[PDB]
């Protein structure tokens, strides 16, 4: 098919620095593999991207591929589950082959758990397994990387070295950050005199920072009913406070 090379990067992400800078370290490594097939070591194996529920790792994803102008290969975990018996490692130990030509490069996996699922258990959970070691070599400088938020639920043999060794721990934006945030999203934004983004970064806290982001652009909106200019405070007040009313379906 032919994969990209996203146009996402760190510094032109969403504020999130503090994951970045691991995940600054895989870039690195694709960037100069080199100076490491010259120091001897490496890793050509993937890492596990875990957290919440919205905290840009599937942006971050992305933003290691960018980040080095190398491909970013990846369906993600998904389409195995919706692909029942026979014909199903088709396009996925086709997908290593891929760049394993066009390296280094970044596979990345969306939420590893779905790998899986007469018999009626997991098995494709049982792949890439192998790969993440062992295949047709093992010298390319490709890497590996998929999300995760509940990383319990899942298969041990996972972390067995030489597979996924490592995990980055982005997370919900401390009450000093989600600040950096907003001042992001406020960008265009017209606004008042008076709008203080640390009140509207206060007990508007418990929420990441997609949520955040919506908070802002939504406050914008409501000038929309009442034709007005400067973005103030109070727009930002009524951030439905803080929706609590999910989990219901």
């Given at each position: 098919?032919?994969?990209?090379?996203?146009?996402?990067?760190?510094?032109?992400?969403?504020?999130?620095?503090?994951?970045?800078?691991?995940?600054?370290?895989?870039?690195?490594?694709?960037?100069?593999?080199?100076?490491?097939?010259?120091?001897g070591?490496?890793?050509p194996?993937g890492?596990?991207?875990?957290?919440?529920?919205?905290?840009?790792?599937?942006?971050?994803?992305?933003?290691?591929?960018?980040?080095?102008?190398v491909?970013?290969?990846?369906?993600?975990?998904?389409?195995?589950?919706?692909?029942?018996?026979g014909?199903?490692?088709?396009?996925?130990?086709?997908?290593?082959?891929?760049?394993?030509?066009?390296?280094?490069?970044?596979?990345?996996?969306?939420?590893?758990?779905?790998?899986?699922k007469?018999?009626?258990?997991?098995?494709?959970?049982?792949?890439?397994?192998?790969?993440?070691?062992?295949?047709?070599?093992?010298?390319?400088?490709?890497?590996?990387?998929?999300?995760?938020?509940?990383?319990?639920?899942?298969?041990?043999?996972?972390?067995?070295?030489?597979?996924?060794?490592?995990?980055?721990?982005?997370?919900?934006?401390?009450?000093?950050?989600?600040?950096?945030?907003?001042?992001?999203?406020?960008?265009?934004?017209?606004?008042?005199?008076?709008?203080?983004l640390?009140?509207?970064?206060?007990?508007?806290?418990?929420?990441?920072?997609?949520?955040?982001?919506?908070?802002?652009?939504?406050?914008?909106?409501?000038?929309?009913?009442?034709?007005?200019?400067?973005?103030?405070?109070?727009?930002?007040?009524?951030?439905?406070?803080?929706?609590?009313?999910?989990?219901?379906?």
């Amino acid at each position: 098919i032919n994969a990209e090379k996203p146009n996402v990067r760190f510094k032109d992400m969403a504020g999130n620095e503090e994951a970045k800078e691991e995940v600054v370290e895989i870039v690195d490594f694709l960037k100069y593999p080199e100076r490491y097939a010259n120091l001897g070591a490496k890793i050509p194996k993937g890492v596990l991207l875990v957290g919440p529920p919205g905290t840009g790792k599937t942006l971050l994803a992305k933003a290691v591929a960018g980040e080095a102008h190398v491909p970013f290969f990846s369906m993600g975990g998904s389409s195995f589950i919706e692909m029942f018996v026979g014909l199903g490692a088709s396009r996925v130990r086709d997908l290593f082959e891929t760049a394993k030509k066009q390296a280094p490069s970044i596979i990345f996996i969306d939420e590893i758990d779905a790998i899986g699922k007469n018999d009626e258990r997991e098995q494709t959970l049982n792949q890439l397994l192998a790969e993440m070691d062992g295949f047709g070599s093992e010298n390319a400088p490709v890497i590996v990387l998929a999300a995760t938020n509940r990383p319990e639920i899942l298969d041990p043999a996972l972390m067995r070295p030489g597979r996924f060794d490592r995990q980055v721990l982005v997370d919900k934006p401390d009450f000093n950050g989600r600040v950096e945030i907003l001042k992001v999203h406020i960008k265009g934004v017209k606004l008042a005199n008076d709008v203080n983004l640390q009140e509207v970064a206060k007990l508007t806290a418990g929420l990441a920072g997609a949520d955040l982001a919506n908070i802002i652009n939504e406050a914008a909106l409501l000038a929309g009913r009442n034709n007005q200019k400067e973005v103030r405070q109070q727009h930002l007040k009524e951030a439905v406070e803080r929706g609590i009313a999910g989990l219901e379906k």
